Design a binder for this molecule. Structure first.
Ligand SMILES: [Mn+2]
Length: 132
């Protein structure tokens, strides 16, 4: 069993950037094959980015390639997603996922992932913060 906790979701201006984090349970250097998925309201869940268990085959969905960067800190069992040039189409709950098993290559299929976090919400929408 692997538990997964995402953080970092928030409200972001169109054109803006965020960084998501996903902490995974286990001893340090557990080195899971992991991925990010997302689901927008009324749409099917979809792959975003992934990495294999041994740190190879960093892979992106066509929707986000060149805008998003996936990285893993093996010591912390943490996965990070730097998201740039965000647009309304990127609004979604973002889910961290992990596989049970030592898979070298990243799978883009949700059926490949045993464990799923609860998600963190990214809202890409124009807004104004009142001054202080
Ligand atoms: Mn803001």
């Amino acid at each position: 069993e692997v538990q997964l906790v995402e953080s970092g979701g928030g409200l972001v201006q169109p054109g803006g950037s965020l960084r998501l984090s996903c902490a995974a349970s286990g001893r340090a250097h557990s080195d899971y094959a992991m991925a990010w998925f997302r689901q927008a309201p009324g749409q099917e869940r979809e792959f975003v980015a992934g990495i294999g268990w041994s740190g190879g085959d960093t892979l992106y969905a066509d929707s986000v390639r060149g805008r998003f960067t996936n990285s893993r800190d093996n010591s912390k069992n943490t996965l990070y997603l730097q998201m740039n040039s965000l647009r309304a189409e990127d609004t979604a709950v973002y889910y961290c996922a992990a596989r049970q098993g030592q898979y070298i290559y990243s799978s883009m299929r949700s059926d490949s992932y045993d464990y799923w976090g609860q998600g963190t919400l990214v809202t890409v929408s124009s807004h104004h913060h009142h001054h202080h």
